Symmetry: C2
């Protein structure tokens, strides 16, 4: 495990969200990883629980893009990106910062997504 | 405490680094805050230890700028920014992502700065 590997994991994650490739997203994660995403709310913990969370993330097709270089050090990575979707004619762009901690095996053991209302950008 | 307060704290932090205003930086932090900055290395814990760390950060004058909107939710904030300095004729720009957790009193209880070698940008 290396910054190069962690950076590549972030890019595979972003591409798999764009693709709607749940096997691909879930495969990045350790068997006992947790995911906490949408506040400082309740973390989901199984392989099964993580898949189900992304299943739901992906109802609408997402356009996902890294908007700066990945920061990768030690066993963690942080990244700024946008998630864009369209619903009943309105485009929304969400701009989180996610954080990944890695396993010694190179797997994501935890992901936390930070964004608040000011990071949801949408017209009427 | 609110996303608006946390966001303002990030901006006061950035301005105080630019100013070289150690009282101003240190005042953002709880009496028992920790700061971990430069890897996944050893966290500094006192008021005194935090001041001493910033004293050292600030030998060279720093030009500091937020490069995207702050993400503020729950009791945490994350932000992407750059720290620029000049030494023996060479300009370096460092591009971290920092993370702050807040106290119920609105004080920073912890700061973690994530950046690796790929986030240090410098010519010869
Ligand atoms: C989960 C997600 C993508 C995966 C990721 O890693 C970070 C985010 C944050 C924005 C989410 C988005 C999924 C779709 C969501 C739930 C909406 O309908 C509004 C907020 C938005
Ligand atoms: C500590 C710092 C500013 C405070 C902050 O919040 C984040 C950083 C990361 C880059 C540091 C910089 C201080 C000066 C440093 C130590 C150098 O001489 C090369 C790396 C650079």
């Amino acid at each position: 495990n290396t910054p190069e590997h962690m950076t590549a994991v972030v890019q595979r994650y972003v591409a798999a969200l764009n693709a709607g490739d749940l096997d691909g997203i879930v495969a990045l994660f350790a068997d006992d990883a947790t995911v906490e995403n949408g506040v400082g709310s309740e973390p989901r913990s199984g392989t099964a629980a993580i898949r189900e969370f992304y299943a739901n993330s992906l109802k609408l097709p997402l356009a996902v893009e890294l908007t700066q270089e990945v920061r990768a050090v030690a066993n963690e990575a942080a990244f700024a990106f946008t998630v864009s979707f369209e619903y009943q004619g309105r485009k929304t762009v969400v701009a989180p910062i996610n954080h990944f901690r890695f396993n010694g095996a190179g797997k994501v053991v935890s992901m936390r997504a930070l964004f608040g209302e000011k990071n949801i950008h949408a017209g009427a």
